[PDB]
Amino acid sequence: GGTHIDLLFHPPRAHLLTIKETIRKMIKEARKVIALVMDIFTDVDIFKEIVEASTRGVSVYILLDESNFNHFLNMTEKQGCSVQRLRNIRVRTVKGQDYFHGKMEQKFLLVDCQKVMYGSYSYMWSFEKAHLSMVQIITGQLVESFDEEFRTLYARSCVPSSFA
């Protein structure tokens, strides 16, 4: 087996779902595991879908850029929905080399070791309404390289300071 890749764009071009609707669909259809690497995560709709998935029993692992993590924490506080009290979600932070903050500038979503969304869309209102972006939907062989990269990032991640 090879690798299959479909492109999606924001705004949409020659496909039926927006990128955001495709993210929510990927998450709603997850059976086993969600592995997410994201620079900035403030989009409440996407967060809700991930929380719902975790309540069905899906194991969710989230790696967030350290410098922007406060924005995720602010969003989860506003929502009354602490990741520390959700048993099936683990969140850790990843940073680069400071000099000015070094950042984890990689974004992808990996579901059931089966499908990846890889591209320039960040989970924020601005990507739904303001920015131009594109992603690949990847299935097949190359997915295993994303699994390996998620594990690689996970190994260099830290428990966030906030958490006890």
Added chain:
Amino acid sequence: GGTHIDLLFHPPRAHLLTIKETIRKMIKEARKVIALVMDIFTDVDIFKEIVEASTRGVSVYILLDESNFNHFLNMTEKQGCSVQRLRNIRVRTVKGQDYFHGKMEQKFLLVDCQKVMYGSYSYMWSFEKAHLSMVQIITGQLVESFDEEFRTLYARSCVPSSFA
């Protein structure tokens, strides 16, 4: 023919060249055309390579995020190297929908309609020294989709205001 994809990382993992050395190599080996879509372009080494390519006769088309274009202009002024006086380089800007600036958040390099570098590396010192990032080197069938996306972006681009 299908599509072939190799991953590269910053910092490097199981490959010989850094992403930046691979960018310079792609550019130095271009025979015909370079098509670049970039959010922020301040890296002087990469810029030098693109100028050299244009002086060999390579047609270079650069699409830059509008909101960050001043940073490119500042870099080319510091370098004494105006894109308006280089006959084989065209530069245009692309913007999103403002509300706060909407941005073109897509980055890729497309050389000779043959090879693409697609991923999270921006052409700035910070990506060489501080940030974690990854790209794909793509060849084969999927390259034609990047060609089509470059043309799509180009059609929605503007002459930058500075230029006369």
